[PDB]
């Protein structure tokens, strides 16, 4: 004789309600901008050709890091047992990235690192020589 409905949770907070109500419109705006930009400029290639995948690079990982990139790439080189190398100089303005994902390939993690780097630094791998080498933007 009782009557219920399916979704029942622990109670909420109105400030969290207002935060989510901002966040939905923010998400829609960002989706709008990204869709229009992708439409107006068509890409040509991708970083898969720059970064292939070889054996021992198929170990898995899950991460949460929010710092300068150098400790992160040194740790991933120590995982891969690869020769780690730098090129150029890190500028006085540091490069900070934030990755919080779940169970990815090392190669896809590195491609995400390059994409979030964008026009500040670039990454390359010589797999046969087993080397991960970065290069900062040699400009300014």
């Amino acid at each position: 004789m009782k009557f219920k409905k399916p979704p029942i949770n622990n109670p909420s907070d109105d400030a969290t309600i207002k935060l989510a109500e901002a966040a939905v419109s923010v998400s829609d705006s960002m989706l709008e901008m990204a869709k229009v930009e992708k439409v107006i400029t068509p890409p040509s290639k991708d970083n898969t050709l720059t970064i292939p995948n070889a054996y021992n690079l198929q170990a898995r990982a899950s991460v949460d890091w929010s710092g300068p990139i150098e400790e992160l790439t040194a740790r991933i080189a120590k995982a891969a047992h690869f020769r780690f190398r730098v090129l150029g100089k890190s500028p006085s303005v540091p490069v900070l990235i934030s990755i919080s994902t779940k169970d990815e390939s090392l190669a896809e993690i590195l491609r995400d690192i390059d994409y979030q780097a964008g026009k500040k630094a670039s990454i390359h791998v010589y797999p046969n020589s087993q080397v991960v080498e970065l290069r900062y933007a040699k400009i300014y």
Binding site: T48, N53, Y55, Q58, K102, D103, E104, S105, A107, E108
Partner: protein, 208 residues
């Protein structure tokens, strides 16, 4: 040439025979070479015979087997249903169909490759289903004790293993669901050294 039923240690060789349909019922070592282009719908081998056919193309075919044959057919067949209850071997070159039912009881060595829109697999015991190079839109596989199956699922994959059952997929299905009961096993057995292997996404990241 309508119905050909044979027993008793024969060797028949033929090529360039044109027919709509004929029914073969072979027994007791029929060594057959058929290098023609023949459509047919039914075939029966009683047991303990080896038969290789080069070229069969039909709109339809229904086949069951009873003994322990060693058969292989070349061509394209829109098969529907296949049941194996003995100690049989089978291999087809191309299949272009939509609905496939497979039942395996005792000992089957089946080697198929082609395009099937919907595949159902039942394996009971000591089944060795090597269905690699066989792309499927929908795959539904149920394996009981000591059954090994090799699948190549593309889009939708459903897998169940009771115990001591090996199920090895060979492609990244856009939807994967697997279950094991007592001692089952669902595994990839991929290569990992390819230049263009892709990882999972948020839609198929199922953890066994």
């Amino acid at each position: 040439l309508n119905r050909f039923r044979y027993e008793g240690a024969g060797v028949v060789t033929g090529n360039n025979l044109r027919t709509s349909y004929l029914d073969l019922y072979l027994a007791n070592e029929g060594t057959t070479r058929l290098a023609g282009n023949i459509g047919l719908q039914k075939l029966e081998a009683v047991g303990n015979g080896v038969t290789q056919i080069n070229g069969v193309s039909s709109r339809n075919l229904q086949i069951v087997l009873k003994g322990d044959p060693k058969v292989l057919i070349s061509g394209f067949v829109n098969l529907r249903q296949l049941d194996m209850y003995g100690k049989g071997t089978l291999s087809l070159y191309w299949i272009k169909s939509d609905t496939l039912t497979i039942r395996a009881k005792k000992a089957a060595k089946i080697q198929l490759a082609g395009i099937v829109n919907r595949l159902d697999v039942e394996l009971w015991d000591f089944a060795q289903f090597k269905g690699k190079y066989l792309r499927a839109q929908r795959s539904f596989v149920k394996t009981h004790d000591k059954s090994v199956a090799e699948i190549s699922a593309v889009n939708h994959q459903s897998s169940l293993a009771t115990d001591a059952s090996d199920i090895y997929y060979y492609n990244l299905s856009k939807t994967r669901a697997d279950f094991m009961a007592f001692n089952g096993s669902v595994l990839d057995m991929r290569e990992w050294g390819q230049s263009d292997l892709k990882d999972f996404d948020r839609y198929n990241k199922q953890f066994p």
